[PDB]
Amino acid sequence: TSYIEDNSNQNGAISLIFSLKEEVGALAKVLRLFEENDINLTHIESRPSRLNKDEYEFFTYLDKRTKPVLGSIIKSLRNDIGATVHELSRDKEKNTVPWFPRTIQELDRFANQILDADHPGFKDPVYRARRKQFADIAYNYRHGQPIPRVEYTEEEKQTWGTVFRTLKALYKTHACYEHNHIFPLLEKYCGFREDNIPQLEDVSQFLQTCTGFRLRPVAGLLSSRDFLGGLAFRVFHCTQYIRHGSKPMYTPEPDICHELLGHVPLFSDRSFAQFSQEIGLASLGAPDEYIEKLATIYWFTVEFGLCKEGDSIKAYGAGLLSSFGELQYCLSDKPKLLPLELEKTACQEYSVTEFQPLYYVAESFSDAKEKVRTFAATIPRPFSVRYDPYTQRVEVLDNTQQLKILADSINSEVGILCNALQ
Amino acid sequence: QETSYIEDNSNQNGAISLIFSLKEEVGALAKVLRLFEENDINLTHIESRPSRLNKDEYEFFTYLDKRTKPVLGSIIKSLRNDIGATVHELSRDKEKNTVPWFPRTIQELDRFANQILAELDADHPGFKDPVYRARRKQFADIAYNYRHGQPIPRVEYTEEEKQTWGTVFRTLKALYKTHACYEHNHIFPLLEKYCGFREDNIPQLEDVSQFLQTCTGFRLRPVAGLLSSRDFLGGLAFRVFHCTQYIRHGSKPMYTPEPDICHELLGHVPLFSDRSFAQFSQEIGLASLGAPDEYIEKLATIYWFTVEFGLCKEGDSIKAYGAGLLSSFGELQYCLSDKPKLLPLELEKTACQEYSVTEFQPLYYVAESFSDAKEKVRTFAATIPRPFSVRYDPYTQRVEVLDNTQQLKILADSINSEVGILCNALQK
Amino acid sequence: QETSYIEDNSNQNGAISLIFSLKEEVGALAKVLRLFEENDINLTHIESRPSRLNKDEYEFFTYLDKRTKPVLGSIIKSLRNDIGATVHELSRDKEKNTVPWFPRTIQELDRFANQIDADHPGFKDPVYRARRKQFADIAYNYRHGQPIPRVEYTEEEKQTWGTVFRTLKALYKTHACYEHNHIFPLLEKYCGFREDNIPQLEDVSQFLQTCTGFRLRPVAGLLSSRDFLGGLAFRVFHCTQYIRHGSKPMYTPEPDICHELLGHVPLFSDRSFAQFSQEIGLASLGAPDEYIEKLATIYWFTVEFGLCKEGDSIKAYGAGLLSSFGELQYCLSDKPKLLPLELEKTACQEYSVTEFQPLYYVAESFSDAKEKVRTFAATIPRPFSVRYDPYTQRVEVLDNTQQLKILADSINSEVGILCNALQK
Amino acid sequence: ETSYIEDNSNQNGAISLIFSLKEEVGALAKVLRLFEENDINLTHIESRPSRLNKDEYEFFTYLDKRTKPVLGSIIKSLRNDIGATVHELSRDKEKNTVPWFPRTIQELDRFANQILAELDADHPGFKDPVYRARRKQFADIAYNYRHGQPIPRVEYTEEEKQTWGTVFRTLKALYKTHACYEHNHIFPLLEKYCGFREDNIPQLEDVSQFLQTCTGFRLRPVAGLLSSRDFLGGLAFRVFHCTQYIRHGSKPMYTPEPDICHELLGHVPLFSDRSFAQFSQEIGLASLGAPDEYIEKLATIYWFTVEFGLCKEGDSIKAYGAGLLSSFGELQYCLSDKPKLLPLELEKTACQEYSVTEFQPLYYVAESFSDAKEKVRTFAATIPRPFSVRYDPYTQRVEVLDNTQQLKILADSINSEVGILCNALQ
Ligand SMILES: [Fe+3]
Ligand SMILES: [Fe+3]
Ligand SMILES: [Fe+3]
Ligand SMILES: [Fe+3]
Ligand SMILES: [Mg+2]
């Protein structure tokens, strides 16, 4: 399957999520309870809460080396301070919540945990060396930096040209409206041409000017948890290399062709961007059982999905828009078509190696987004999550007061629409 | 009587901008891009992006100036008549039947960020100091060469300058506990702990801007001097606060005929870190976008009595949140005494209130809260004559220009999203 | 294939109704009432009430028939041109440039509530035919607002009710949806749902009114699809009072009192289902006959022979299933073909009333089915939208602007209620 | 002397239990057995399905003091052994109880006859034995009135019609320039279809039928003045307790008491407007279960809004208070520059002192009926009650919502209605 269970680094990841009401001495008493336990001031940032105007959020950057004394601190936090404390761990210890990034920058920490004798390019040492060049670019990439530009050889551009030519001649009749709606803009402003491979930095800037999505160079395949979690911030982990030239039509790995031709156009659409982001927010802190379901749902939606377009049916899956063979296949009378239902979809078996015998048809990107949100409600999590695009940080709703501020902001926006119709 | 309103100028080339959308149709996009390209308007000035609401439309962002003015009428005429597209024309010189120009993206703040209202006045308390004049011209060159997206250059301050900062910091801090609003006293300890806000250290704009980004998304922008009211307020719509980098002259630490680093960091930065205040000031920025000069005046007066010299209600008591108060020990004590006259905040009357920058304000307007002031601003903004509505998009950091129908769609879809969030979060 | 769709007829006089509003202006109201009075249309047929949305407008309810047809064109011509009022013309004979008539108030259900065999299992029984005409005469004489006349049933009829009641109840726990089994004990406790007792329609209607506001209305026989579905818009369920023939308690190619009380009444007591069926009723008001057909098919596969999703299992909520021991067992076997509810597809599904349904449509829930019906109803060609007002028990006819205003103000009120109730 | 009347209690009083129960094998029978085993018969306890929690049951209990010996045991078993949030309603307002209020529109009957009995010897009709006798006729009509019945029609004398004509003529000649737009919008309809004429006294049945066809409001004959709690609570169901008698003929322009002119000329037109109906109903929903201190505030709020209110109409100011629209003298007074005007703010309004006897020196001006309704709802949140209330016009019953699961269904109904508006926009 397309699922990759997350591992853990040498040190792992520990994070504490808790809020504190402002009260004389409370901030100093918390910072001293961390500092006296050899947790220096550099690991504990304190910022004002985005809803409870009288509370403070604390972001803790820890690892397993602190674990012997973590329980003591948590015991004092919950009992002596009276704060609901969530414990995030990447090793998924008992009484912990599966770790997820709280800020967009914290994606850096485990963005390099990658994962060949049968690949059609193993015997080529130049190709292997180039894959290690692109891999080193990603290994050294940090959030906020421009994506390093790489001049491709003419052989690589010939492979890109063959894939570009054959797919483009097929998008008009096989791709969804949104793909064909944005693709001309990518051709005009991102250098999408038969003789040119676009630069990930230029493409990332275009996505940022459309839906705020951004590309992040990755050396290889990340875990499902890490990738889906990256979607919560509208961050699409993207590969920079291209498939080997000998077989410019067969590829069991996502190259620059699959990422730019299959994913980028739809990631530039608001409705699809909100859809994929909704999948990301659903993944944050979910159990591995639900990381499974989201990964399978992603395989049948973002990867191999079909959507309704009037009385006809068009393809929006990146695995379809980047595979001439299966893109033609998916609109014939051969495939089996079912309506998208996430309770059943999340349990549908599939094989990555062969062509999918069964596709799930979505009503629309907006209806698919609502289905995902509904499915996300069923996911066992000790809190809820909402993304804040101003600070590029995920806010964790669970308190009642936070629902009051959110409900009163809704009531204000409703009254804005009431005074608007006049 | 003097005020704080600064009417905007125009550069050598000025600013022209076209706001229009186009329905997708075979050849329509190429026919529009061709009519621009064939008139020597190269592709770098015409961006085309998908509309956020109409899934079948394209938005066009045009970066033009007067060098295009000979061909503007022909192009507009073909767009409206031969192509059938509703075209709004933004001009900075404000010709009739045009909308006062405003930046559509956060990057376009660079273009007119240097239009200052230039040897400082011979009445300034630093005119006799040749080192001070030269140092002010150092900071001015930092801002003149600053462009959006770059880190703010760090500058080591002298020992005298840090002594001036220490004198102002110590005297004010000893008074914040009893005179500042709850939000200021809520964030101020965080600035002391994470931004190096100390009596012996002047913070660096880059560290403070990064902190604001981690609180409310606000960001600092080094500016050489005072910008026009239109440009400054328009910058607030993007949560961009144009900030000065220099410090007051050492001789007179309690007088500043200009706003230095003391007024910006001690008066503005704490509240800009609060969500309610950030949304309030941002609403003022959205209100300014494309308003006539008469209404840029009223908004400037509202800003003077709210963000600059405002008082807010806090239970049964009254505390100060104006930056001009939180950075002036003398008037901070004055504004809570029995001397000033206090009225409830009502923007229709506030926008016409006379005021003097030089002397202490005889009359202050009290706001219920930052949320109530935000609601009053939007209501006041509805009365502003503008041929469209505006809304900020924090994902793309771009301003969305919408009509009445499109404004109803975003409101309905933003409500639908937040209600669906409340539904899932209620069970959790 | 003999469907459940019954095209509507017309009486001798029919029904004509004008829907229009007028801005208040000195003499304008009297000038409108005068142009009706001068054409021998007296004031008792023209009601004038204040509009609920436009504080400066008046609503006019006109009760007319074919006797007005000679003068309809003149009056409409003056209303549209000389007075400047958008006038919709409702006619039951569906002439061109008219809207298919529907009742505007709950009282107008009276007007066509009376617009009603050699193979029936009671054709040879002259006593049974006479009793069916007794119940028919009960309904013919029934008018809205009156209590439903109580009728003592015989001991043979109560034996038939007992046979049907016993066999079905022994099967509801494992075959009926959660809502049916949730309310059924309350019907047994307060409405006399027992093996030895046939409930009285008056007691059941009063119970429904205390649950979801639904109310029963005695009907002699089968009404047209337009009239019956239109009756659902007011939460009025036209209900039969007779019982099936005693010889075959497990048959009847038509619905008797057992089908109405055991199949419909429990579900009509659930709020979500009440809003769902009412939404179908609101969809029917003024719809073309092609869409009256589609709504009849949608009703046949939802309210009549529907299946609903219940956790990982599937349960029956169709009244035709909950009142048919044979097909209730059948519908949950592996034999039928199950498709997800899609009203654009559902409305075109073939079906036969005589035989078991080969295909059932599964609904996600009653709340989700309500949203599907309204969305489908938006596609129905009508020059306006309709919304029911339970305070006045009258239907509101609204344009697009007015519908957005009520939707916005209803949301604004419900959101403020949720805001105040959260802090408790 | 304010317009507030503290609620009394009858001889048996009123006890009511508000609780819900999730369906589970035997749970319904366990509740009915817990009442029955304590000699609390089935005829006082109806069980109906909850409107929001599709898996719960609502219980409506009609009890009195004779049930009180076993109530504590039952509540203890309900709360502990059954796990149900139980609210205890008592009409005598004991500690740890909620002030009783009607749960259904029919339950208004029970205490509708509790008068504030001969007439005050200062009334302008004390010396008239026929007038005293006539007041006891109307009072006895109300004493025998029960909800759902048509209001008995009474032929008025010529003297009564003369008094009605004097009040009608003088006020109507002043409504065009002094009454709000809504009053002048509906008043011609009342004249044309309800017999509002100078020579005719309307019948409460015809007016009640007209109100039902406009906003669903309905008139209820009452013998005299009810307590503030009972009257305001009646507004929650859009039921207006209405007097049937008329003022004494000698002084047609004076009235301590509210006669038929105050009810028909002051209240009925506005009760026919949706916005005003929703406004007064919101006041009624605010009263349900409020402490007597907040029954005070709501009574004062009602006195300065529905009774003696002013509303904004463009740049001018018009009167909509029933106490103004039925008093020619003060109707002219209230629109001059002599009175003192303050903006409507319920935290200040609810504590403003006033005197019923003399003309009000101070009026509160409302922005609109919708803005006044929103202010009431906001104020209602501050009222100490262990739950919230919402009216259900289909079943004519008040739904009480305290738990989170009921806020879910309320949030989902909002989410649906928003998606409805989204699809209708396209
Ligand atoms: Fe992929
Ligand atoms: Fe300032
Ligand atoms: Fe049926
Ligand atoms: Fe009164
Ligand atoms: Mg130094």
From Swiss-Prot, chain C:
The lineage of its organism: Eukaryota, Metazoa, Chordata, Craniata, Vertebrata. The keyword Iron applies. Homodimer and homotetramer. Gene3D superfamilies: Aromatic amino acid hydroxylase. Fe cation binds at residues 259, 264, 304. The gene is Pah. N-terminal region of PAH is thought to contain allosteric binding sites for phenylalanine and to constitute an 'inhibitory' domain that regulates the activity of a catalytic domain in the C-terminal portion of the molecule. It comes from Rattus norvegicus (Rat). This is Phenylalanine-4-hydroxylase. Catalyzes the hydroxylation of L-phenylalanine to L-tyrosine.
